[PDB]
Amino acid sequence: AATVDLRIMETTDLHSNMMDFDYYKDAATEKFGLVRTASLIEQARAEVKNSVLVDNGDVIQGSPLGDYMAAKGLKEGDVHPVYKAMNTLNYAVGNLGNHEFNYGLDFLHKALAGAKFPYVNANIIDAKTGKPMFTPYLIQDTRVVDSDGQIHTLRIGYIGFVPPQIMTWDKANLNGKVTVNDITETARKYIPEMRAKGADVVVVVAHSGLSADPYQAMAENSVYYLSQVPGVDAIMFGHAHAVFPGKDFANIKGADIAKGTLNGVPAVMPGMWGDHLGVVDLVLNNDSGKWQVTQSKAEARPIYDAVAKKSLAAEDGKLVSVLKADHDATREFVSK
Numbered sequence: 234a235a236t237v238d239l240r241i242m243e244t245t246d247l248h249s250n251m252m253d254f255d256y257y258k259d260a261a262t263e264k265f266g267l268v269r270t271a272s273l274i275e276q277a278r279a280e281v282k283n284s285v286l287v288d289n290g291d292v293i294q295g296s297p298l299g300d301y302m303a304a305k306g307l308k309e310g311d312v313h314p315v316y317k318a319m320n321t322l323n324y325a326v327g328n329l330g331n332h333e334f335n336y337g338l339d340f341l342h343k344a345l346a347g348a349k350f351p352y353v354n355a356n357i358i359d360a361k362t363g364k365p366m367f368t369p370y371l372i373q374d375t376r377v378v379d380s381d382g383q384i385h386t387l388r389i390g391y392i393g394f395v396p397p398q399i400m401t402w403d404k405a406n407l408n409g410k411v412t413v414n415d416i417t418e419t420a421r422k423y424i425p426e427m428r429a430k431g432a433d434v435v436v437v438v439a440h441s442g443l444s445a446d447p448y449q450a451m452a453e454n455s456v457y458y459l460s461q462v463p464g465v466d467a468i469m470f471g472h473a474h475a476v477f478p479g480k481d482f483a484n485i486k487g488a489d490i491a492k493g494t495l496n497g498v499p500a501v502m503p504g505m506w507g508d509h510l511g512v513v514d515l516v517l518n519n520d521s522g523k524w525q526v527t528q529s530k531a532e533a534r535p536i537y538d539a540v541a542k543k544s545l546a547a548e549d550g551k552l553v554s555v556l557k558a559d560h561d562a563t564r565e566f567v568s569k
């Protein structure tokens with residue numbers, strides 16, 4: 234009769250903002266940057282015994298560092314600066330966002346190969362074979378400790394999703410090479426497979442926003458429908474660049490903004506560019522023979538207090554150090 238606490242943390246829509254630096258203003262900021270969101274990560278890890286960290290994608294594109302690296306290109310064996318940073322943070326898994334496709338599939342494969350953590354995506358299919366182009370889900374053996382100090386191997390399943398709209402947004406890069414299936418339909422079909430293979434917890438990492446529209450296949454923003462799929466234990470999301478739980482979502486049926494649940498499922502969307510860290514806390518109990526979630530909550534933790542005008546997250550010294558060369562090159566690139 235063990236009780237386990239599990240914390241799941243999430244970065245989303247970093248958009249290659251590794252540095253807390255605005256290259257157009259050519260000046261530092263306290264408002265965004267992974268180097269600051271890393272302080273929120275370290276703090277959240279220290280508050281608990283058991284934790285895991287995921288990235289929700291839209292990470293290799295969308296700021297000058299990204300622009301610089303796209304223009305520079307990647308040769309075989311190169312490590313993209315976002316992974317130079319993220320490889321030090323012990324991510325459990327990465328998910329693909331729509332902007333990961335903006336520079337073509339070759340560029341993407343080379344970029345992902347530099348990550349020292351696995352990537353998932355379940356809904357993109359190789360047009361040549363009918364096989365998922367990527368690993369659709371990961372079941373990861375995770376060492377955890379219960380409330381009595383007893384150690385267990387928890388089998389945590391992670392499954393990732395991208396908007397089907399990449400077929401439009403990146404038509405030139407993707408047309409004839411891949412197709413993309415409906416998010417909810419893909420979740421419904423894989424979750425039973427994952428449970429049959431021994432997943433104890435199922436973590437959806439969805440690069441997709443939240444909408445109250447009635448379900449329709451190929452919906453870009455599918456988090457509502459995901460929250461109704463049996464066996465979903467948590468939803469780590471993004472794409473919308475908004476904050477959940479939060480007031481923007483007060484009018485959605487089954488959204489408990491105080492708890493951070495959507496139809497009883499903990500869910501979090503931590504804004505954009507590293508300006509929040511997503512934090513889901515689950516309570517698990519195995520006294521029925523299976524691990525079951527008995528309590529859950531979620532919040533998005535800001536790096537900056539907007540009312541009080543103060544930072545809540547220091548600039549991480551070591552990451553700045555790792556990024557130094559690429560930061561200078563980025564300053565170079567923007568001036569040229």
Ligand SMILES: [Mn+2]
Nearest residue numbers: 246291472474
């Ligand atoms: Mn985005």
Ligand SMILES: [Mn+2]
Nearest residue numbers: 291330331472
């Ligand atoms: Mn996006």
